[PDB]
């Protein structure tokens, strides 16, 4: 049941998201765009959408690397940064937390990056609550954990980073890129779960519930596949073990994650999942995308729901990437490797 509540606040966040979804690239468009190889045709399809605004500005029949990145950055400012500020209540909060959770991977990478020494300025696009002009640099200069805690308290509302810092004190996060990121993701998915649990009584989660679990299963099998034949430390959570309702089990994920080859698991898991277990790294990669792409669209059937807006954000990240992938091939007159091969969005 949803729409069994009257909300001043939910009404604003839901309409503004619907307003964007109108001009937004449909499933049919993406299907048309792969077929293309004509420079002019790619422009036309896109001119007409939310992304089309930026395309019009500088008119380029062959789209280079830079143009694509600039258009996506522009597009995340109107759609995500802005929206939060004219939104209020529990609905603005839910948007802040999803944006901040994405920020925790980006900012974590910037901090870790200082330790390695690296060049900074503009950092590649993600959905972040405030740009790289506000929050991310202020967090970045503190590499000292003690000062991290203090810097999060200045941010009103609080970031997740405050908990993440508590943890890295007691050394449950260790060092090295791969292990940290696996723990940051484990927390990320854990926060999704706590929110649904509080949120559910007035806007139910049906479509969202199925998508959140299928997303979780995919993320974890993917992390495991990555650390299969590359080295894996067995007592660490580099297997991405996290609660589940029984769709993916801790045992079956652990078997895959270690270096012993455990391709079988994927096949047994699938009965309606796209990924079915293959010997081709590339074919696995294709399937992952299509699965996670489905059920977001289904979520749109619901409305007046926390379910709708969540599924939409996660679809947007997958569309910005599709645009990039297709656009570049057509530019230098080649066809797509991953996108031409996938056919279900």
């Amino acid at each position: 049941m949803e729409g069994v509540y009257f909300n001043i606040d939910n009404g604003f966040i839901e309409g503004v998201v619907r307003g964007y979804r109108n001009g937004l690239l449909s499933n049919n468009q993406y299907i048309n765009l792969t077929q293309c190889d004509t420079l002019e045709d790619l422009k036309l399809q896109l001119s007409s959408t939310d992304y089309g605004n930026f395309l019009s500005s500088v008119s380029s029949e062959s789209l280079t690397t830079s143009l694509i990145q600039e258009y996506a950055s522009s597009k995340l400012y109107h759609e995500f940064n802005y929206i939060r500020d004219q939104s209020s209540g529990s609905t603005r909060k839910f948007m802040d937390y999803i944006t901040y959770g994405y920020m925790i991977d980006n900012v974590a990478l910037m901090i870790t990056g200082t330790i390695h020494d690296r060049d900074k300025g503009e950092i590649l696009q993600r959905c972040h609550p405030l740009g790289w002009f506000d929050t991310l640099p202020t967090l970045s200069v503190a590499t000292d954990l003690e000062s991290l805690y203090e810097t999060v308290l200045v941010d009103t509302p609080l970031a997740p980073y405050f908990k993440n810092c508590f943890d890295t004190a007691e050394e449950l996060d260790d060092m090295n890129i791969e292990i940290i990121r696996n723990k940051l993701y484990k927390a990320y998915l854990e926060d999704f779960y706590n929110f649904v649990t509080e949120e559910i009584p007035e806007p139910a989660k049906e479509c969202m519930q199925t998508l959140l679990g299928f997303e979780a299963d995919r993320r974890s099998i993917n992390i495991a596949l990555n650390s299969l034949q590359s080295s894996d430390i067995d007592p660490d959570l580099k297997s991405d073990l996290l609660p589940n309702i029984g769709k993916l089990y801790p045992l079956a994920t652990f078997h895959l994650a270690q270096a012993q080859d455990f391709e079988g698991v994927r096949a047994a898991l699938a009965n309606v999942y796209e990924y079915r277990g293959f010997l081709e790294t590339g074919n696995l990669e294709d399937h992952f995308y299509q699965l996670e792409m489905e059920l977001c669209r289904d979520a749109f059937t619901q409305q007046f729901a926390i379910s709708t807006v969540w599924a939409w954000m996660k679809s947007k990240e997958q569309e910005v990437r599709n645009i990039t992938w297709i656009a570049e091939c057509i530019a230098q007159n080649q066809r797509e490797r991953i996108n031409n091969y996938i056919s279900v969005y």
Binding site: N28, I31, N32, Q35, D37, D41, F262
Partner: protein
Amino acid sequence: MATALYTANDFILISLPQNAQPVTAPGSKTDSWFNETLIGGRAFVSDFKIPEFKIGSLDTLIVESEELSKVDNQIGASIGKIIEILQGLNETSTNAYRTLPINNMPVPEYLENFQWQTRKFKLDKSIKDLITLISNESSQLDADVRATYANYNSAKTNLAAAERKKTGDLSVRSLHDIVKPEDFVLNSEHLTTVLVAVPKSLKSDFEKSYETLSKNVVPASASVIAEDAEYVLFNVHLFKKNVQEFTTAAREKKFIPREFNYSEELIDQLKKEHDSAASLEQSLRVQLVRLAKTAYVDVFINWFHIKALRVYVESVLRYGLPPHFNIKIIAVPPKNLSKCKSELIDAFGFLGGNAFMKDKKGKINKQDTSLHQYASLVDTEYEPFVMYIINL
């Protein structure tokens, strides 16, 4: 227990010394016990008496077992892929090729008449050459079946791209089978034809607009030559200079032009692509189905050649002398394997160890541990007498 079960019988291959006597039935005969006593008499025994071979020395013997284990597993895997290539092709559906003939003799009937095959594998040859010949044959055959199934999958992809071009969805499609000399004019160079892919809503919008898109647009040319669900495909004739104005004007209205001229070579080559793609997939599929079936039999004869060899050499390693062994293939009816395996262990187990023996049952395959894999190259759990479990 199982690993690719259809309706095929499961087999246990055993070998024993000629002094061995069961302790489960004392004073009884081994040959009689297998048929009569063994899992309530529902045990069907078939001969499978493997000849003598050239056995190496003691140092060479360790190395002969190590290789038999590896090669055995390769052949076993590779056959598993061939069965799969068929299953996917729909050449194995209900049951096919696990009970089907093996040179005009079914699989269970073939094992009973299998005693060693002197097809090219000789006992005047060394052991070493027998492992190298059989294994090479098995690898090479799998590689050809794999190369054709890859090529067939590619070939399907080309044909699918082609049908859609020849009619389906417009975004890359240009028509070439619906040509006509007047709905498609180009014979000098003054007139040309531009085709316009128009969404259904927009169909009225095109019929009204067509004349205004550029100057010198031929009258009443706008007709739907072809129509699909999402789109309606129009032809309009106009002057060549004007084609640039026409196309740009078309894109403002929010149509999508599809450029195709009526050059003779164009029409012919697209048509050709459809045909050439159907002929490639067709020829290939017939050779490919045939090639796997022919490969399947050969890798079957070769899988059993290693096992026979493997079992023989092993028997020599574990019991010692006599080099003359009493060897059988026992057909177990499906799901009685565990009960069969246990009974054999109790009777015969004392021979190979009076303390190196424990009760065990069935066959479990894993990469969790290396234990329970019954092999002489990796550490496993030691069986009390030579017994190998075959799952079909």
